[PDB]
Amino acid sequence: SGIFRDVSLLHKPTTQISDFHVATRFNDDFSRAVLEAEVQMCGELRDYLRVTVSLWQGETQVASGTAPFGGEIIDERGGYADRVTLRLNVENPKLWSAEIPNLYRAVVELHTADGTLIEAEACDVGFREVRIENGLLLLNGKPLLIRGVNRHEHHPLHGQVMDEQTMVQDILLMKQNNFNAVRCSHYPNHPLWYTLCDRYGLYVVDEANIETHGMVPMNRLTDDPRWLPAMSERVTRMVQRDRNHPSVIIWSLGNESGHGANHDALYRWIKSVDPSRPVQYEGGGADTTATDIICPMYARVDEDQPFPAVPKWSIKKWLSLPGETRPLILCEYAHAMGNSLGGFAKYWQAFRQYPRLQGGFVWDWVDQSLIKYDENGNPWSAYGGDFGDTPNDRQFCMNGLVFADRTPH
Amino acid sequence: DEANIETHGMVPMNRLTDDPRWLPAMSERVTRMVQRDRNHPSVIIWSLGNESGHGANHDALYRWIKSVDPSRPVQYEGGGADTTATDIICPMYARVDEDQPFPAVPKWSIKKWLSLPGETRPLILCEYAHAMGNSLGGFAKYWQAFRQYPRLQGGFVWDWVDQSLIKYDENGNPWSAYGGDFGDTPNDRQFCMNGLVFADRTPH
Ligand SMILES: [K+]
Ligand SMILES: [K+]
Ligand SMILES: [K+]
Ligand SMILES: [K+]
Ligand SMILES: [Mg+2]
To answer: Which of B27, B50, B30, B26 is nearest to B38 (CA)?
Structure first.
């Protein structure tokens, strides 16, 4: 517990940019794009106000649009007088992927018609399209093969406080070890993580901070409408924060919370507000109406595990169940606890052979061991129970491909 | 029940079945079969013939049967076993786990085939487990797959009975003969014997 991420003060004008959303849509061969930026303000509207959105490729301005406030009519009462949407044509855009993380810079200026800046906000923009078509997850029209890992935010001295050096260490080691993707198990991460993933190139599953695993049954809260409001803010406030990062390619509704009607409501809410990214969620059997991707945890390659209600089929068999058409990407597989990863090659051979097996996220990146000191002041790696915590789950906190200090297993 | 249409030795295999010249002759092979046999409850599927590539004549006759008799699926394996002229993915000699990625007409692993992007049909092999001589090695691998995968709905072994013929030696004693034993040439020798049973119905 505690105040474990940054604290800041931000001084904005009273007439201010209060939100902006950046979308990029493409023609059939990605030779042309439109960047559409919706910009919202708070404060006092004045007829001399304007917004300009400009797009930069390094030091060169490649596109720009300027308009006064006042959006299109949307219903019988008019439109948003406090919004405007800029549309920028971009010819032959450099496309973003984990392979080549090409980025542009978008600068959003709130200014006056005669040239005075009120304030500016900005983001890195990666031109890429994510869509599911004919059962395949496509990035810029090509089917992804996710070499993923789940990564919790953990440091053996600082607990759950993340810092730039440790983030960078982790991304370098991930890419050096042929990972291209990370799942934010199981919550939104420190804001710097997405900047780093945008710039170094990793595909990100951004996951709402909702896990109710110890309820019986697992969906007791997520099926209860009285919990829809609290759940809703965990999803909606994540999308409002992170929706402009190109590295985020998939939203997840949380983890191990069964499947309840609140899931279906929030699945639909994201699909409404952001059609640019698939939504996944594994709870309730991994192939429910709240997920665009079959996303099981620890389904095996050839062996079925036919549990009541929530079976984990062989991933090869799952793809072809009667009526099923979705891609399958394991949200967790290959549990790397202690001396493990036996069988890892069997997954990769299947992922290469079956178009719709589009990979998975290993569980997990780093052991959650914590440093304690003995009588002599010498450090040692501690696990569950070592702090007098009880009940505890002992060494199950260490499931990493690397030790807590980032040494490889 | 399968129409008497096979043009395997054409090059390419569909040279006649894509030729509207040959649409009349093929049409009567299909239509006169359905007119004869459509009251039999044992017929559950119609087939448009065998090893004749995939031609437009197949698509015309597929839809003729779908129109006249909605009570039975139509299948046909030619042209890669999963064309627009078949309601059932019906490959011949597709293997259980191993792909054979032939150009144009690949034989995928049957487990892979079911889940190719956009595919939803059942798969029943029109021919599998070629029982020539000392064979049926790997038979159990098919059955384990058929039982594990709902949409792998089985197959037809190739085939029931050896096509050996009886000849008589200089003493009048009978012996089983195969391709070329009648002075027939060119011939394909013992390939005519692929059965689970010998020609006299003794089991292999
Ligand atoms: K694949
Ligand atoms: K664990
Ligand atoms: K079956
Ligand atoms: K033969
Ligand atoms: Mg300017």
So the answer is: B30
